[PDB]
Design a protein around this ligand. Structure first.
Ligand SMILES: [Mg+2]
Lengths: 205, 124, 109, 62, 43, 339, 242, 62, 145
């Protein structure tokens, strides 16, 4: 029942990044009807810096995840709209992540749009509240100045720190971009807790 | 044990002939077909000073002196020649070359140490 | 165009470094000798005594090791601990210099 | 039992002692012994055994 | 016989000559119990 | 009182209870890979001595006899089947452990403690602090934390000092409660993402603060001290400052004098030691300790906390591979006790 | 070892825990440092006192094994088949004549005065006074229904080096026993002082058995005819349920 | 190295004179002294039964 | 699929004990708690069930925990899984921390095989030559300079 979990935790995810919803919510039945009829559902959110984040939830049996041409035209038509876009989130079924053609359209759109963050994610990333999962430590993005002060005290470069992918689920929920620093407060059975700082690297897809 | 009944006629390497062997007081059917190898040692199952811990044993020195588990151990020295080049004989310091330092060439008789003499480290 | 290799690259000899000593009031490493550092100090001093034999120790000992140990314990050892902190890409070698005659000694006697 | 010397027969290629009792060479401080000595921090013992007592030499590099 | 066969295995150059070593001034014998020796003493 | 075999077992010198049972009462069921003897002798027969589809328990490895009574031929064969595994698993526990030990060491050996107590591979951080506490494993003491299991009423009964009506002791206790809550919160979470890892009120710490106080109390010529308002307040100020300056154990005494800012990850490292000191040096527990004896206690705590730190330049990746690959020998020895 | 007939490397049995060794045919290497640098490093870093506490498990490695574990129990035991577990002054003095420590003072004792094993052990643990209170390995709920435990043996208590009550066995003196007597001595006085006490208490335990005796026989493994009938009634119930 | 027919091997650790070995009231003294702690974990009961049977075999002359 | 979740073969019932804070502040160990220990792993399949608490799903699979939760949870999973193998005469916790921190240093779970050494220390040819295959490693190092 991935759709039912998504319908709630995608809005929980929008809330967790401190984003303002633009379009009013619809019932879950209407969400399923739109996904089956259109082939996708769209959720638009407002960021503090007035950026727009658009989330596309694609059906597992939709056309956009099977034929690369439909995804290509959809992305091209959504990426030339009069909106202050900053990120498009394309939530597709896990098998779609292994479909090479879809990823090729994704990377082609990335190349054609250098200032827009394009990410494609599986369903399970938004079928739960990732930060509230017990096994996941407390992640927190830190500023560049604070990280530079830490590195200067430690005589370190950002390339010496432990590194974390930008597609890591807690980093995704934080909104971590490559080149950012994430401080992780994690439990310890030797000191009762510990703090590490990780350098965010490029997403795997 | 008696590793072979024809041991004196053999030149064997790393072979041990234990002099005294006993039939076990509690024998088995296997001893109708092979010679027993060992002795019926008197054993005390006790703590005596901590010298038999961790699978060690304490032995009677008198039992050792009387020949318990005593025997003769044999080694072999087979040396070959090069046809018409090499020969067996006692070398001479004033002709031969690269003699081993600190070696005792004085025990040789016609190239071989005679039977019955005690050879120690460094003896030729 | 990427042309033939030039003499500006192909250098095998690394450029020389400048030893940058952290001021004593900005040192971050511990003021206590590690067991490794104390062992190394005693070993070096004992070998150098086996070479020279000149010491300022008042007591008399029959071994270089004993003299070195008593020099370390009595804070009379003529050695310094240099803790190499970093090597900067611009050439510097940032180190900390520690005087073992005013550090805490872990060893016992 | 075995105990050898400060010196003896040496391999022509590696320059290290020969193998064991029968060749009158040395005994082996193997891969796992260097792990233990490194774990202990005993680096001057590694110099004494693996360099002074085995094949340590001087290499000249421009 | 080849140059590159000297390297690979346990008996090769890297594992036998470089990571391990034949050494001098060393002894070996069977070990034995002795209750009069301290824990930091060897007979 | 007289049986030597029983005394070797009951005192822990050598042997176990199943050893006595096997010798004296009965061996019981031979069980290989947590199951009975499978029929490998022609489709439903375990041996030539038992029929096909035999239903008796003896046909599948149940040994009814003890060693002192002797086993029959089928029982000895089933016992030899079980005993052959012990020899096979012993020979495998050398090679299988050797393969895993060498791969663990070549993956971990480059990890070395640097001058910051971090673990790195030549520049690159593996740990921000070794063991997340920066201590040597040979310098640890197993110590119980008193406040963990107590309820809110018996926490305030035992650790809230009511002798002086000051706001200082209101926060001296409130700091005790929120250390108790933080310990519960963190270690109940660890219970959550494990199978059977229960919370404990017992930690391995570098300094046994409770035994330091007990030792000095014994050697003190004083008895029960009279009530002294200024001395009780002074000791609280001494302990609070000591807990404030505790992370300077990880830097040096030069920065402690200068009071330079402490890294956040070093404040976390001294969390258990800060927590333990506030329990064992609570005002209710230090009524019979003078302000001069408190300085002796505080000087001993940070001297033992300095002696337990990990050395610069220690090959801790080799230490970890040795400590993890060695229990794999016993894991391989018990291979036939697992499914 | 000045005897020319000895060809073995001899060591104390309590040192075997460092090397996972025993005396069934194991061979060990031995090299003596000759250079000053390696000979300094052997003393300060690689001395076996530096690994009394395991780096793997953070607990003690050494202790009593197999003769001083049962010997400590017999020495510290409250009662003996001969009555009370006491010894006269001469035999109490004889327990300390091998420990290689400074002998205690027995001047306040007549030849006919009787000393128990707890007094003799206390004379040794006074030099490194520790505090210990745990139940010994001797007490087990498994044996309690079928054995009459002595109430002075099932609670080992040491305060300031005086063994107040209880027996010493694997729990207190055994090798690898976390929180044991030698683990506590190491944490308070150093791992080298703990090694001295492992040796000194091993000589007390072995010198007690020097005339107490300890053996195992075949009759120790033999059930009585009435008990053999009870065991096969138990097995017959298992085969009945099967 | 010595061993019994039950597989309990051992290394000769100490050699005592005939006046230092323990003796029974009737003068019997052992040739080997083996630890009782080698039995309980190995369950070599055939070695203990052999001693019990062989003790009466010697006196009975059988 | 008929009446189940994919990937799990057997689902037994186990009794487990957990701690909990009472209303009076006391911490009590509760032994009467029933859970389900499955045979087979599917975190996402169990995450979609309404009879399972999705926030406290404990998988024994490092690969599945890394896939859904991340590198930090996978680090905690390597620690938990090595400790299970180690038994109870196991090493100190700081030796399990060393394994997990090494294996998760790059943001991905790397192995203690030749492939894992390549990911963490690619330019250390001499370390990498010494492990398994000098000729292949040396050949690659020369062409790569
Ligand atoms: Mg052996």
């Amino acid at each position: 029942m991935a759709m039912q979990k998504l319908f709630t935790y995608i809005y929980e995810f929008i809330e967790y990044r401190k984003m303002v919803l633009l379009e009013e919510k619809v019932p879950y039945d209407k969400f399923v009807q739109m996904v089956l009829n259109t082939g996708f559902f769209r959720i638009n959110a407002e960021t503090l810096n007035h950026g727009i984040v658009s989330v596309f939830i694609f059906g597992a049996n939709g056309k956009y995840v099977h034929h690369g041409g439909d995804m290509r035209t959809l992305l091209t038509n959504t990426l030339n709209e009069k909106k202050h876009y900053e990120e498009l989130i394309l939530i597709v079924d896990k098998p779609v992540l292994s479909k090479k053609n879809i990823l090729d359209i994704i990377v082609e759109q990335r190349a054609a749009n250098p200032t827009i963050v394009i990410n494609i994610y599986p369903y399970h990333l938004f079928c739960i509240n990732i930060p509230k999962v017990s096994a996941i430590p407390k992640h927190k993005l830190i500023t560049q100045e604070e990280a530079q002060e830490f590195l200067g005290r430690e005589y370190l470069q950002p390339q010496d720190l432990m590194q974390i992918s930008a597609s890591d689920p807690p980093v995704v929920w934080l909104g971590g971009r490559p080149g950012d620093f994430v401080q992780i407060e994690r439990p310890s059975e030797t000191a009762m807790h510990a703090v590490v700082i990780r350098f965010i690297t490029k997403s795997k897809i | 044990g008696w590793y072979c009944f024809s041991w004196p006629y053999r030149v064997d390497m790393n072979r041990f002939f234990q002099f005294y062997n006993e039939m076990p007081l509690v024998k088995t059917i296997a001893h109708n077909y092979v010679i027993p190898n060992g002795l019926n040692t008197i054993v005390a199952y006790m703590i005596y000073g901590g010298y038999n811990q961790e699978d060690s044993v304490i032995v009677s020195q008198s039992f050792i002196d009387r020949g318990g588990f005593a025997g003769t151990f044999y080694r072999e020295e087979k040396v070959e020649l090069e046809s018409d080049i090499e020969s067996f004989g006692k070398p001479d310091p004033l002709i031969t070359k690269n003699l081993k330092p600190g070696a005792n060439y004085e025990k040789l008789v016609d190239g071989f140490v005679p039977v019955g003499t005690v050879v120690k480290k460094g003896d030729i | 165009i990427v042309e033939s290799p030039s003499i500006c690259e192909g250098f095998v000899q690394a450029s020389s470094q400048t030893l940058v000593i952290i001021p004593d009031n900005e040192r971050i490493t511990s003021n206590v000798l590690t067991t490794f550092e104390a062992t190394r100090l005693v070993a070096v001093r004992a070998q150098q005594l086996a070479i020279n034999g000149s010491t300022m120790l008042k007591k008399k000992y029959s071994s270089p090791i004993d003299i070195a140990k008593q020099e370390l314990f009595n804070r009379k050892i003529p050695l310094l601990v240099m803790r190499c902190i970093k090597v900067t890409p611009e050439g510097q070698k940032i180190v900390e210099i520690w005087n073992p005659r005013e550090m805490g000694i872990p060893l016992l006697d | 039992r075995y105990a050898v010397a400060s010196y003896g027969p040496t391999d022509a290629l590696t320059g290290q002692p020969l193998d064991g009792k029968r060749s009158h060479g040395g005994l082996r401080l193997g891969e796992m012994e260097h792990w233990v000595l490194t774990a202990q921090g005993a680096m001057q013992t590694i110099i004494e055994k693996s360099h002074d007592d085995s094949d340590g030499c001087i290499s000249y590099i421009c | 016989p080849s140059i590159m066969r000297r390297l690979p295995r346990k008996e090769g150059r890297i594992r036998k000559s470089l990571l391990g070593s034949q050494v001098w001034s060393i002894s070996r014998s069977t070990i034995c119990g002795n209750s009069d020796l301290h824990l930091d003493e060897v007979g | 009182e007289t049986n030597g075999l029983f005394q070797m077992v009951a005192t822990g010198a050598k042997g176990s209870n199943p050893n006595m049972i096997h010798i004296m009462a009965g061996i019981g069921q031979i069980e290989i890979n947590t199951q009975r003897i499978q029929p490998q002798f022609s489709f439903g027969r375990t041996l030539v001595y038992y029929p096909r589809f035999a239903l008796e328990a003896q046909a599948y490895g149940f040994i009814c006899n003890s060693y002192i009574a002797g086993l029959t031929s089928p029982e000895f064969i089933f016992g030899e089947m079980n005993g052959r595994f012990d020899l096979i698993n012993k020979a495998l526990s050398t090679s299988s452990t050797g393969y895993a030990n060498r791969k663990a060491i070549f993956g971990l050996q480059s990890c070395i403690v640097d001058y910051y107590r971090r673990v790195s591979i030549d520049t690159r951080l593996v740990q921000q602090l070794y063991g997340e506490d920066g201590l040597d494993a040979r310098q640890l003491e197993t110590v119980r934390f008193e406040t963990i299991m107590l309820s809110d009423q018996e926490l305030e009964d035992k650790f809230k000092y009511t002798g002086i009506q000051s706001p200082l002791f209101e926060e001296e206790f409130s700091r005790l409660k929120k250390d108790r809550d933080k310990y519960r919160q963190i270690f109940l979470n660890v219970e959550n993402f494990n199978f059977s890892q229960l919370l404990t009120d017992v930690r391995q710490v570098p300094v046994n603060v409770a035994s330091i106080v007990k030792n000095i109390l014994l050697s003190s010529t004083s008895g029960v001290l009279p009530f002294d308002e200024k001395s009780i307040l002074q000791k609280y100020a001494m302990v609070k400052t000591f807990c404030k300056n505790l992370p300077y154990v990880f830097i040096n005494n030069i920065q402690e004098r200068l009071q330079t800012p402490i890294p956040v990850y070093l404040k976390r490292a001294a969390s258990l030691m800060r927590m333990l000191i506030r329990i064992e040096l609570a005002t209710v527990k230090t009524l019979n300790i003078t302000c001069e004896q408190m300085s002796a206690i505080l000087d001993l705590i940070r001297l033992q906390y300095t002696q337990s730190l990990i050395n610069y330049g220690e090959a801790v990746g080799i230490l970890a591979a040795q400590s993890v690959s060695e229990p794999l020998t016993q894991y391989m020895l018990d291979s036939h006790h697992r499914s | 070892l000045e005897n020319p007939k000895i060809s073995t490397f001899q060591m104390n049995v309590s040192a075997c825990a460092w090397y996972n060794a025993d005396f069934d045919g194991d061979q060990m290497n031995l090299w003596v440092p000759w250079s000053v640098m390696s000979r300094v490093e052997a003393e300060l870093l690689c001395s076996v006192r530096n690994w009394f506490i395991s780096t793997k498990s953070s607990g003690p490695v050494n202790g009593q094994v197999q003769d001083s574990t049962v010997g400590s129990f017999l020495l510290t035991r409250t009662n003996t088949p001969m009555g009370k577990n006491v010894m006269n002054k001469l035999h109490a003095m004889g327990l300390f004549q091998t420990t290689q420590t400074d002998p205690p003072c027995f001047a306040n004792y007549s030849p006919t005065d009787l000393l128990d094993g707890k007094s003799v052990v206390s004379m040794l643990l006074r030099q490194t006074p520790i505090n210990y209170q745990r139940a010994p390995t001797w007490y087990s709920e498994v044996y309690a229904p079928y054995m009459h435990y002595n109430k002075q043996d099932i609670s080992t208590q040491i305060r300031n080096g005086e063994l107040i009550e209880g027996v010493l066995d694997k729990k207190a003196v055994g090798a690898g026993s976390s929180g044991g007597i030698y683990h506590l001595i190491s944490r308070r006085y150093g791992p080298q002082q703990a090694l001295k006490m492992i040796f000194a208490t091993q000589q007390l335990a072995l010198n007690y058995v020097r005339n107490a005796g300890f053996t195992v026989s075949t009759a120790d493994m033999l059930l009585t005819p009435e008990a053999h009938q009870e065991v096969q009634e138990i097995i017959n119930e298992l085969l009945l349920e099967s | 190295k010595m061993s019994s027919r039950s597989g309990n091997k051992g290394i000769a650790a100490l050699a005592l004179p005939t006046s230092d070995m323990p003796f029974t009231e009737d003068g019997l003294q052992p040739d080997l002294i083996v630890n009782p702690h080698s039995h309980p974990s190995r369950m070599t009961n055939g070695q203990m039964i052999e001693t019990t049977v062989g003790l009466a075999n010697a006196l009975q002359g059988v | 699929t008929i009446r189940g979740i994919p990937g799990i073969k057997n689902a037994n019932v186990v009794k487990l004990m957990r701690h909990r804070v009472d209303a009076q502040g006391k911490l009590v160990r509760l032994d009467n708690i029933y859970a389900i220990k499955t045979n087979g792993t599917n975190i996402f399949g169990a995450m979609l069930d309404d009879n399972i608490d999705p926030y406290t799903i404990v998988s024994s699979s490092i690969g599945d925990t890394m896939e859904l939760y991340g590198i930090e949870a996978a680090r905690q999973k390597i620690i938990s899984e090595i400790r299970t193998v180690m038994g109870d005469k196991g090493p100190n916790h700081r030796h399990l921390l060393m394994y997990a921190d090494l294996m998760t240093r790059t943001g991905q779970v790397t192995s203690l095989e030749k492939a894992g050494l390549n990911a963490r220390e690619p330019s250390n040819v001499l370390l990498r030559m010494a492990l398994s295959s000098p000729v292949q490693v040396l050949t690659d190092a020369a062409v790569d300079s």
